[PDB]
Structures are given as structure tokens and as C-alpha cells.
Design a protein around this ligand. Structure first.
Ligand code: CA
Ligand code: CA
Ligand code: CA
Ligand code: CA
Ligand code: CA
Ligand code: CA
Ligand code: CA
Ligand code: CL
Ligand code: CL
Ligand code: ZN
Ligand code: ZN
Lengths: 310, 308
């Protein structure tokens, strides 16, 4: 095995490829590209990665983007969780760690859902195998005062593990199991929905192909996603997990947190609330938001996100 | 903040790569763990933000949707780097005298018809490209001509486009692509038209990254070759058209000084079946390296297009 990485020829090639000695441009982008390319070249040298192996990796990247699954792989190999770990460490150093814990967004948010005052019913399609579920709570600041007019958004899967706008078996109604609620004067929000089921990666897709290569499964336990925002506060990205799911501590995207597994309560009286059975489940999920530091939210994330019209 | 060295992060990497899993593909897990660890460390060291990361994730979607991962591999020098490591291995083994290798590029098409000695490979009219004869002798490093060696070439038209990859309309199958078996004296000949340099698809992922770096995505005019023969390794090489202003500024870093032959002006082209009496001739002799104990330690298997 040869070792060439630390030769002038290779180091000059990397400088040229990243255009380090180029005219005034995007120095930050060039710095990132040079670092990533240098690390890749060094890894090839150290592990003696063969051309056949490299071209197989190149081919996988083609499949990954052809499948549109780069963000699913980002969750599956722990990169999305890692970003949360770094955000959590920064919050702890700054004293901005007093709110409800964050966890990963995942790749399935859809913008444009209808907004209701106080209460929203979000199961637009019938799903005989999912039972009714009420999610409710109060949004407060870290000082405990209720936040009125805060925006609570949630999205989750049906009983087959599919989300509206991403269902391969057939179109769901737009924004099925997706809603937004403006909290009332006392900070309260409530969703009436159906119970989600966990799901697995598309089995022929690039993410499952790599997981199979590693010997890992690509399943998530049942969960519900939230964004919560409000004037004067940071935007929270979080979720909760459904108690009792066998995969709850074996999520392929490493997203479960012990503080985000709320007690599920058995209730009756569902028909009066517009649910399809007398018996239903209720999950209380309170939210504590952190005030902005210096008037700016330095952890809100901009990424490509789907959108639709109601 | 710096979190890379923490137990939480190192445990996450071990789980993500399944290092502690049942017996499996140990080599694949090793590579994945190394690449993931390096990525995580780079994010920590350079304080790469979530917004930046998700832009990079979005780029990977576009790269694969465009089918351009191998074009990017050329443009950021990874393909040249693979050649650098192969060259270092050959030097350490004491090999010299062979025609230098250079990059394959991503545009080979398998299945071209094989002709004896001479092949006319310009099937489509191209008014702006003049006639070109490429000819030469294939030998081994002992200087002896190799008879029945397989010489393959492919190159672009006057618009910079290759058959099977032309966005402006399908070319005839195997236009400007051919394969010849050398004659008893090692000789091969292609009758073709003069290539012009290739450029990246302007709206594609490779050119988008290059624009962000402030780089061009252009290649000087060149002709690709595969050359193979009994008792010898398979050679991947090319030559460049002398005098091209980009000859030492290839965005894929492929030029080598021994692969720039002289171009000669000739007459008599009609008798050779060329479209005009005046034509250009390039004599490109090729020297193959022998096998080692029957083995070829540098032939590359990668996905390649095909046609009939
Ligand atoms: Ca390193
Ligand atoms: Ca209904
Ligand atoms: Ca197993
Ligand atoms: Ca109703
Ligand atoms: Ca010698
Ligand atoms: Ca013709
Ligand atoms: Ca045409
Ligand atoms: Cl998700
Ligand atoms: Cl090429
Ligand atoms: Zn989800
Ligand atoms: Zn080419």
C-alpha cells in the first residue's frame, strides 16, 4: 500500500480543486470544500480504498439523489442527531437550555397547513386501523407565563406509517395529519387526530441499501413532530414518542429523548368531541419556549422543505 | 463549542456504523465509520452550521438527480488522485517505459463494433469539424509490436458533445467511438473528425459547485483510449490536441506532457474516404505494461453505459 497524501503533488491538487489561490470569491465555501476533499483523500490513502470501491461509492451517490433520499440518509447515519448535539452544547454554554428539549425535524415537514384558533382537527382521511388521539398542552416561556398566540404545528404518520404528500400507495388529502394551532389567551393548544404508527425506510431506496450493508434496520418508533414558535421566543423543533413502542429506544435516526415520552391516558366521551369512538387516548405535551437572546434566534434552521396548497 | 471528542458523539458514530454488530461486512463498516467520523470532526472544527449542512444535503440530491456524481469526481480531482496512487504503486515497483495513464472520465460507452486494423468512426455529419486520422503502433515495454491488441477510442464532436450524452438530440449509436484490433505489425488507425473540448452541463450540479468555487468547468480537446492485449495490463489514457488554450487548465486535471502529439497537415484524404483532400494526422504510438505473474493490478471496474 502506497502513501501519497502528504506529497506536494496531492497538496497542490487539493489547493487547485478548491481554488484556494483563486481570485476574490466565497472563501468560506472554498475552506469547507478543501477540508472535506482533504479528509476524503486522506481516508482513501489511509484505508487503501481502491478505485473500484471509490466508483461504487460514486454510484451510490447517484442513486441517493435519484431517490431523493439524501436527507433520509442524513437522519439514518446520525448526522441530524449530531447537529442537535452541537446545538444542545451551545445552548448549555449560553444558558439557553431551559426550554423543552429539541430533537430532529426529519425530512417530512410540509408548509401551508391551515391554522386554527385553539383547537384543530387534523385527521382528514378515515383510517379504520388507527384509534382517536387528543394531543393538548400549554405553551409557556421559561419564566412560566403563558404565551398567547403562539404557533403550534404538528405532523405525523397514519396507521400504515405514511405521511400526507409522501404516501407511495396513493395520495392522501392535502395536509392529512398536519395542522397548526394559534394558542388561546391562556397558552392552550389542542389537536384531535388519530394515533400514528412507526414506519420503515423505502425498502429499495438508497438509505435502506446502505443500512442493509451495515446490518442495521431502518425503522422508527411511532412519534409526533412539532414546531412551536411565538413572538419574542426561539423556534422549537421537537417531537414526542408514543409510550410502549418496542422500537422506542432503537430508532434508526437516534431521536428519542427520555423527557419526550409522555404518559398516554385512556379517556371516554369521544363522540362529544367529534371522534369516531367513545374511547380515545389523550397525550398532554406542554411546551416551554426560550426567549430570544439579543433579539435573534441563532438556532432556527433553514432547509429545503415541501409545500402545498390546502 | 467542540463536542467531537465526547462519549455521546463517539458512541453515536459506533452505533451509526454498527461497529458492535453481528458479523457482517467489516470493510464496509470500517469505511463508513471513518468517513462519518471525519465528517463529524470537520463540522465541529469549522463550526459548520445546520443551514450549511442541509445545503450540502440538498446538493447531494441534485447531484444524483442530475446523474453527475462521476463528473464531480473528475472536477474536484478525485479521479486524478486515483491515478496518482496507481502511478505511485507502479513507480515503487520499478515500472517505467509505459505510456502514462490518465483519467477515464465518465463518458465511455461499451459495445462498439471492433474492426480489423482501421475503423471510420464519424457516422454523423459535422460541418464545423475537419477530418482527422489517428494512427499508431502498439508495443510492449520490450519494444516488440503487439498484434491483435484492442485499441478503443471515444471523443466529442464540434459542439463538445459525445454520442449517448448529447443533450441537443440523439447521435447515431457509437458516433465518434470505435475499436480496432491491431494488425500484424501492431498498427491501428481511426478515421474520424477533430474534437473540440467538453464543458459541464451549465445548470447541472458539477458546474454549480464549480461556480461556487470560482472555477470553470471546461476541458481542452482530447481523445480517450482504452488499450489492451494478451500478456499486458489494460491501459487507460488519452491525448490532447496541441495548441488548445485550455491544454494546461483542464478542470479535471488530466493533461500529461507525454500525451500531446504533434498534428501534421496532410493531403490525399479522399482516397482514404475522408470528406476533404486536406486533413490532419496524429501519430499516437502506445506502449503497454506487461502483466505481473498473470495479474492486472490496476484495471478498474465501474458502472459504464452501453448500447447496441
Ligand atoms: Ca483527520
Ligand atoms: Ca373522517
Ligand atoms: Ca442481524
Ligand atoms: Ca368537524
Ligand atoms: Ca524499464
Ligand atoms: Ca454517415
Ligand atoms: Ca445532431
Ligand atoms: Cl420523520
Ligand atoms: Cl470526458
Ligand atoms: Zn416522522
Ligand atoms: Zn472526454
Amino acid at each position: 500500500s502506497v502513501k501519497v497524501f502528504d506529497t506536494k503533488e496531492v497538496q497542490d491538487l487539493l489547493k487547485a480543486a478548491a481554488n484556494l489561490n483563486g481570485d476574490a470569491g466565497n472563501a468560506r465555501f472554498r475552506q469547507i470544500v478543501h477540508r472535506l476533499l482533504s479528509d476524503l483523500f486522506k481516508a482513501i490513502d489511509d484505508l487503501d480504498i481502491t478505485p473500484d470501491e471509490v466508483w461504487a461509492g460514486v454510484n451510490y451517490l447517484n442513486k441517493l439523489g435519484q431517490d431523493g433520499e439524501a436527507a433520509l440518509l442524513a437522519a439514518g447515519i446520525g448526522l441530524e442527531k449530531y447537529l442537535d448535539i452541537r446545538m444542545d452544547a451551545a445552548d448549555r454554554a449560553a444558558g439557553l437550555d431551559g426550554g423543552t428539549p429539541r430533537t430532529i425535524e426529519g425530512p417530512l415537514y410540509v408548509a401551508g397547513a391551515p391554522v386554527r384558533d385553539g383547537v384543530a382537527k387534523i385527521d382528514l382521511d378515515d383510517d379504520a386501523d388507527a384509534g382517536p388521539l387528543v394531543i393538548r398542552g400549554t405553551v409557556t416561556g421559561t419564566d412560566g407565563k403563558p404565551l398567547a398566540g403562539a404557533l403550534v404545528e404538528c405532523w405525523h404518520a397514519n396507521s400504515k406509517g405514511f405521511y400526507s404528500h409522501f404516501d407511495p400507495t396513493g395520495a392522501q388529502t392535502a395536509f392529512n395529519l398536519r395542522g397548526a394551532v394559534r394558542t388561546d389567551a391562556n397558552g392552550k393548544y389542542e389537536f384531535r387526530t388519530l394515533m400514528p404508527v412507526g414506519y420503515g425506510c423505502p425498502p429499495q431506496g438508497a438509505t435502506q441499501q446502505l443500512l442493509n450493508g451495515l446490518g442495521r434496520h431502518g425503522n422508527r418508533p411511532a412519534h409526533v413532530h412539532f414546531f412551536v414558535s411565538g413572538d419574542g421566543h426561539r423556534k422549537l423543533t421537537t417531537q414526542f414518542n408514543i409510550e410502549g413502542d418496542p422500537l422506542i429506544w432503537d430508532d434508526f435516526a437516534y431521536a428519542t429523548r427520555e423527557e419526550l415520552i409522555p404518559h398516554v391516558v385512556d379517556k371516554t366521551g369521544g363522540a362529544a368531541l367529534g371522534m369516531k369512538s367513545d374511547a380515545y387516548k389523550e397525550i398532554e405535551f406542554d411546551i416551554v419556549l426560550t426567549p430570544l437572546l439579543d433579539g435573534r434566534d441563532n438556532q432556527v434552521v433553514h432547509r429545503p422543505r415541501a409545500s402545498a396548497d390546502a
